[PDB]
mmCIF file of all heavy atoms in Angstrom:
data_model
loop_
_atom_site.group_PDB
_atom_site.id
_atom_site.type_symbol
_atom_site.label_atom_id
_atom_site.label_comp_id
_atom_site.label_asym_id
_atom_site.label_seq_id
_atom_site.Cartn_x
_atom_site.Cartn_y
_atom_site.Cartn_z
ATOM 1 N N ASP A 1 98.738 97.144 82.938
ATOM 2 C CA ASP A 1 99.881 97.795 83.559
ATOM 3 C C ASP A 1 99.560 99.269 83.763
ATOM 4 O O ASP A 1 99.256 99.981 82.801
ATOM 5 C CB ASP A 1 101.122 97.624 82.690
ATOM 6 C CG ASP A 1 102.370 98.149 83.358
ATOM 7 O OD1 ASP A 1 102.302 98.501 84.554
ATOM 8 O OD2 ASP A 1 103.425 98.204 82.692
ATOM 9 N N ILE A 2 99.623 99.727 85.010
ATOM 10 C CA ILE A 2 99.242 101.085 85.369
ATOM 11 C C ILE A 2 100.467 101.820 85.884
ATOM 12 O O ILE A 2 101.276 101.258 86.631
ATOM 13 C CB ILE A 2 98.112 101.104 86.416
ATOM 14 C CG1 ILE A 2 97.575 102.527 86.594
ATOM 15 C CG2 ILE A 2 98.605 100.560 87.744
ATOM 16 C CD1 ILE A 2 96.463 102.638 87.634
ATOM 17 N N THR A 3 100.594 103.080 85.483
ATOM 18 C CA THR A 3 101.695 103.952 85.882
ATOM 19 C C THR A 3 101.114 105.088 86.715
ATOM 20 O O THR A 3 100.525 106.028 86.171
ATOM 21 C CB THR A 3 102.432 104.490 84.663
ATOM 22 O OG1 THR A 3 101.506 105.156 83.792
ATOM 23 C CG2 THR A 3 103.094 103.357 83.910
ATOM 24 N N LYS A 4 101.279 105.001 88.032
ATOM 25 C CA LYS A 4 100.806 106.036 88.939
ATOM 26 C C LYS A 4 101.898 107.083 89.098
ATOM 27 O O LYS A 4 103.014 106.763 89.518
ATOM 28 C CB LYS A 4 100.428 105.443 90.296
ATOM 29 C CG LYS A 4 100.048 106.486 91.335
ATOM 30 C CD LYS A 4 99.550 105.847 92.622
ATOM 31 C CE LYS A 4 99.140 106.893 93.654
ATOM 32 N NZ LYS A 4 98.616 106.267 94.903
ATOM 33 N N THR A 5 101.576 108.329 88.760
ATOM 34 C CA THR A 5 102.509 109.442 88.889
ATOM 35 C C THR A 5 101.804 110.586 89.600
ATOM 36 O O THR A 5 100.820 111.131 89.089
ATOM 37 C CB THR A 5 103.033 109.892 87.527
ATOM 38 O OG1 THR A 5 103.628 108.777 86.853
ATOM 39 C CG2 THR A 5 104.071 110.988 87.703
ATOM 40 N N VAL A 6 102.316 110.946 90.773
ATOM 41 C CA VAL A 6 101.787 112.027 91.591
ATOM 42 C C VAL A 6 102.843 113.115 91.658
ATOM 43 O O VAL A 6 104.019 112.831 91.914
ATOM 44 C CB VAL A 6 101.410 111.536 93.000
ATOM 45 C CG1 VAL A 6 102.643 111.023 93.726
ATOM 46 C CG2 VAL A 6 100.738 112.645 93.806
ATOM 47 N N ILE A 7 102.430 114.352 91.410
ATOM 48 C CA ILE A 7 103.326 115.500 91.441
ATOM 49 C C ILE A 7 102.785 116.501 92.448
ATOM 50 O O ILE A 7 101.587 116.808 92.446
ATOM 51 C CB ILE A 7 103.475 116.146 90.054
ATOM 52 C CG1 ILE A 7 104.530 117.247 90.111
ATOM 53 C CG2 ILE A 7 102.144 116.714 89.579
ATOM 54 C CD1 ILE A 7 104.918 117.786 88.760
ATOM 55 N N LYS A 8 103.667 117.004 93.308
ATOM 56 C CA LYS A 8 103.286 118.011 94.286
ATOM 57 C C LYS A 8 104.289 119.155 94.270
ATOM 58 O O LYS A 8 105.207 119.169 93.443
ATOM 59 C CB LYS A 8 103.202 117.393 95.681
ATOM 60 C CG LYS A 8 104.519 116.814 96.175
ATOM 61 C CD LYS A 8 104.393 116.236 97.576
ATOM 62 C CE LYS A 8 103.458 115.036 97.609
ATOM 63 N NZ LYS A 8 103.422 114.408 98.956
ATOM 64 N N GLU A 9 104.134 120.105 95.186
ATOM 65 C CA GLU A 9 105.088 121.194 95.279
ATOM 66 C C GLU A 9 106.487 120.636 95.516
ATOM 67 O O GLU A 9 106.665 119.515 95.999
ATOM 68 C CB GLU A 9 104.716 122.149 96.413
ATOM 69 C CG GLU A 9 103.295 122.698 96.351
ATOM 70 C CD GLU A 9 102.998 123.426 95.054
ATOM 71 O OE1 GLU A 9 103.957 123.791 94.341
ATOM 72 O OE2 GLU A 9 101.806 123.634 94.748
ATOM 73 N N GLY A 10 107.487 121.434 95.163
ATOM 74 C CA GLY A 10 108.865 121.025 95.321
ATOM 75 C C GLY A 10 109.428 120.218 94.176
ATOM 76 O O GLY A 10 110.565 119.741 94.278
ATOM 77 N N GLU A 11 108.679 120.045 93.092
ATOM 78 C CA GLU A 11 109.168 119.350 91.905
ATOM 79 C C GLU A 11 109.660 117.949 92.270
ATOM 80 O O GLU A 11 110.847 117.633 92.198
ATOM 81 C CB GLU A 11 110.269 120.166 91.221
ATOM 82 C CG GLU A 11 110.503 119.813 89.755
ATOM 83 C CD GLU A 11 111.249 118.507 89.571
ATOM 84 O OE1 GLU A 11 112.269 118.302 90.260
ATOM 85 O OE2 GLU A 11 110.811 117.682 88.741
ATOM 86 N N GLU A 12 108.719 117.112 92.695
ATOM 87 C CA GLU A 12 109.036 115.741 93.073
ATOM 88 C C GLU A 12 107.869 114.839 92.704
ATOM 89 O O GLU A 12 106.796 114.927 93.308
ATOM 90 C CB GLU A 12 109.344 115.646 94.571
ATOM 91 C CG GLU A 12 109.926 114.312 95.001
ATOM 92 C CD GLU A 12 111.224 113.987 94.289
ATOM 93 O OE1 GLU A 12 111.820 114.906 93.689
ATOM 94 O OE2 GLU A 12 111.643 112.812 94.323
ATOM 95 N N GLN A 13 108.086 113.973 91.718
ATOM 96 C CA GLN A 13 107.095 112.994 91.303
ATOM 97 C C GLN A 13 107.796 111.666 91.078
ATOM 98 O O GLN A 13 109.006 111.610 90.843
ATOM 99 C CB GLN A 13 106.354 113.423 90.029
ATOM 100 C CG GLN A 13 107.211 113.438 88.772
ATOM 101 C CD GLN A 13 108.290 114.493 88.820
ATOM 102 O OE1 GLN A 13 108.333 115.312 89.739
ATOM 103 N NE2 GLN A 13 109.176 114.480 87.833
ATOM 104 N N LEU A 14 107.018 110.593 91.140
ATOM 105 C CA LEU A 14 107.555 109.250 91.000
ATOM 106 C C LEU A 14 106.573 108.411 90.207
ATOM 107 O O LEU A 14 105.364 108.467 90.449
ATOM 108 C CB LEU A 14 107.824 108.608 92.367
ATOM 109 C CG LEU A 14 106.614 108.286 93.249
ATOM 110 C CD1 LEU A 14 107.068 107.555 94.505
ATOM 111 C CD2 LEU A 14 105.838 109.542 93.617
ATOM 112 N N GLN A 15 107.096 107.638 89.259
ATOM 113 C CA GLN A 15 106.268 106.777 88.417
ATOM 114 C C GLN A 15 106.146 105.402 89.072
ATOM 115 O O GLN A 15 106.611 104.378 88.567
ATOM 116 C CB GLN A 15 106.854 106.687 87.016
ATOM 117 C CG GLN A 15 108.309 106.257 86.984
ATOM 118 C CD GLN A 15 108.846 106.155 85.576
ATOM 119 O OE1 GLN A 15 108.243 106.664 84.631
ATOM 120 N NE2 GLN A 15 109.985 105.491 85.424
ATOM 121 N N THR A 16 105.487 105.398 90.228
ATOM 122 C CA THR A 16 105.289 104.175 91.004
ATOM 123 C C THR A 16 104.274 103.288 90.282
ATOM 124 O O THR A 16 103.151 103.054 90.731
ATOM 125 C CB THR A 16 104.850 104.505 92.424
ATOM 126 O OG1 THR A 16 104.541 103.293 93.125
ATOM 127 C CG2 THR A 16 103.630 105.429 92.436
ATOM 128 N N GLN A 17 104.702 102.787 89.127
ATOM 129 C CA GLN A 17 103.859 101.926 88.317
ATOM 130 C C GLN A 17 103.666 100.571 88.995
ATOM 131 O O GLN A 17 104.509 100.103 89.764
ATOM 132 C CB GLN A 17 104.477 101.732 86.932
ATOM 133 C CG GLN A 17 105.790 100.955 86.953
ATOM 134 C CD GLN A 17 106.317 100.652 85.571
ATOM 135 O OE1 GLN A 17 105.690 100.984 84.566
ATOM 136 N NE2 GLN A 17 107.478 100.011 85.513
ATOM 137 N N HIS A 18 102.540 99.933 88.683
ATOM 138 C CA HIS A 18 102.192 98.621 89.213
ATOM 139 C C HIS A 18 101.944 97.685 88.042
ATOM 140 O O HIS A 18 101.089 97.962 87.196
ATOM 141 C CB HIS A 18 100.948 98.693 90.094
ATOM 142 C CG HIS A 18 101.097 99.582 91.286
ATOM 143 N ND1 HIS A 18 101.194 100.953 91.187
ATOM 144 C CD2 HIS A 18 101.148 99.296 92.608
ATOM 145 C CE1 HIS A 18 101.304 101.473 92.396
ATOM 146 N NE2 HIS A 18 101.281 100.488 93.277
ATOM 147 N N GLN A 19 102.679 96.583 87.997
ATOM 148 C CA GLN A 19 102.561 95.657 86.885
ATOM 149 C C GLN A 19 101.402 94.691 87.093
ATOM 150 O O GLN A 19 101.204 94.161 88.189
ATOM 151 C CB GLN A 19 103.860 94.875 86.711
ATOM 152 C CG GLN A 19 105.085 95.754 86.574
ATOM 153 C CD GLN A 19 105.024 96.621 85.337
ATOM 154 O OE1 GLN A 19 104.122 96.474 84.518
ATOM 155 N NE2 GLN A 19 105.985 97.524 85.190
ATOM 156 N N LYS A 20 100.645 94.453 86.027
ATOM 157 C CA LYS A 20 99.615 93.421 86.003
ATOM 158 C C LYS A 20 98.656 93.564 87.181
ATOM 159 O O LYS A 20 98.397 92.623 87.932
ATOM 160 C CB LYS A 20 100.253 92.037 86.004
ATOM 161 C CG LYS A 20 101.145 91.775 84.819
ATOM 162 C CD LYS A 20 101.546 90.317 84.770
ATOM 163 C CE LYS A 20 102.365 89.927 85.988
ATOM 164 N NZ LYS A 20 103.600 90.752 86.112
ATOM 165 N N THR A 21 98.113 94.764 87.324
ATOM 166 C CA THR A 21 97.120 95.020 88.356
ATOM 167 C C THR A 21 95.820 94.356 87.931
ATOM 168 O O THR A 21 95.177 94.790 86.972
ATOM 169 C CB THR A 21 96.935 96.520 88.557
ATOM 170 O OG1 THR A 21 96.386 97.098 87.369
ATOM 171 C CG2 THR A 21 98.270 97.174 88.863
ATOM 172 N N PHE A 22 95.436 93.297 88.635
ATOM 173 C CA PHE A 22 94.215 92.585 88.294
ATOM 174 C C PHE A 22 93.045 93.552 88.228
ATOM 175 O O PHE A 22 92.868 94.388 89.115
ATOM 176 C CB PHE A 22 93.939 91.502 89.329
ATOM 177 C CG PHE A 22 92.586 90.890 89.207
ATOM 178 C CD1 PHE A 22 92.375 89.823 88.362
ATOM 179 C CD2 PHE A 22 91.523 91.382 89.936
ATOM 180 C CE1 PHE A 22 91.131 89.257 88.244
ATOM 181 C CE2 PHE A 22 90.275 90.819 89.823
ATOM 182 C CZ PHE A 22 90.078 89.754 88.975
ATOM 183 N N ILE A 23 92.254 93.446 87.164
ATOM 184 C CA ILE A 23 91.081 94.290 86.965
ATOM 185 C C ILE A 23 89.797 93.498 87.166
ATOM 186 O O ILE A 23 88.984 93.827 88.029
ATOM 187 C CB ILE A 23 91.109 94.958 85.574
ATOM 188 C CG1 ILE A 23 92.349 95.839 85.436
ATOM 189 C CG2 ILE A 23 89.858 95.779 85.356
ATOM 190 C CD1 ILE A 23 92.499 96.870 86.539
ATOM 191 N N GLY A 24 89.596 92.461 86.379
ATOM 192 C CA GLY A 24 88.398 91.670 86.479
ATOM 193 C C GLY A 24 88.544 90.381 85.721
ATOM 194 O O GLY A 24 89.653 89.945 85.410
ATOM 195 N N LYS A 25 87.407 89.762 85.428
ATOM 196 C CA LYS A 25 87.354 88.554 84.620
ATOM 197 C C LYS A 25 86.471 88.789 83.408
ATOM 198 O O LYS A 25 85.368 89.328 83.527
ATOM 199 C CB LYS A 25 86.818 87.380 85.426
ATOM 200 C CG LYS A 25 87.621 87.084 86.662
ATOM 201 C CD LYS A 25 87.106 85.840 87.347
ATOM 202 C CE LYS A 25 87.930 85.502 88.572
ATOM 203 N NZ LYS A 25 87.811 86.548 89.628
ATOM 204 N N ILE A 26 86.953 88.373 82.248
ATOM 205 C CA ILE A 26 86.220 88.482 80.991
ATOM 206 C C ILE A 26 85.829 87.075 80.562
ATOM 207 O O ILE A 26 86.698 86.205 80.486
ATOM 208 C CB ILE A 26 87.060 89.161 79.897
ATOM 209 C CG1 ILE A 26 87.562 90.523 80.374
ATOM 210 C CG2 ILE A 26 86.246 89.309 78.632
ATOM 211 C CD1 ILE A 26 86.468 91.462 80.826
ATOM 212 N N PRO A 27 84.555 86.802 80.298
ATOM 213 C CA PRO A 27 84.187 85.476 79.794
ATOM 214 C C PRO A 27 84.763 85.239 78.405
ATOM 215 O O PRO A 27 84.892 86.166 77.604
ATOM 216 C CB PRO A 27 82.657 85.518 79.777
ATOM 217 C CG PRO A 27 82.329 86.950 79.645
ATOM 218 C CD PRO A 27 83.390 87.694 80.389
ATOM 219 N N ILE A 28 85.128 83.987 78.131
ATOM 220 C CA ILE A 28 85.803 83.603 76.894
ATOM 221 C C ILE A 28 84.922 82.629 76.124
ATOM 222 O O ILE A 28 84.450 81.634 76.682
ATOM 223 C CB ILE A 28 87.185 82.983 77.181
ATOM 224 C CG1 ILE A 28 88.260 84.063 77.251
ATOM 225 C CG2 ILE A 28 87.576 82.009 76.097
ATOM 226 C CD1 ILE A 28 88.043 85.075 78.323
ATOM 227 N N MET A 29 84.722 82.905 74.834
ATOM 228 C CA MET A 29 83.921 82.038 73.978
ATOM 229 C C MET A 29 84.674 80.759 73.664
ATOM 230 O O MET A 29 85.883 80.782 73.421
ATOM 231 C CB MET A 29 83.577 82.740 72.666
ATOM 232 C CG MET A 29 82.850 84.038 72.852
ATOM 233 S SD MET A 29 82.388 84.843 71.312
ATOM 234 C CE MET A 29 81.496 83.564 70.461
#
């Protein structure tokens, strides 16, 4: 789960988080 937060002039940011952003595959024993 990633929380993208961008802040610029004018005091305006948003926590446009993305749930369960696929990353890769891990082999399982």
Side-chain angles (χ1 to χ4, degrees):
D1 186 8
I2 190 181
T3 56
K4 175 174 181 178
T5 304
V6 62
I7 186 170
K8 61 179 65 175
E9 306 303 343
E11 201 285 313
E12 190 59 15
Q13 68 294 353
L14 67 175
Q15 54 179 15
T16 175
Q17 66 174 358
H18 299 69
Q19 306 297 353
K20 300 190 297 301
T21 65
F22 169 87
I23 299 306
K25 302 185 178 65
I26 305 304
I28 272 61
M29 303 182 54

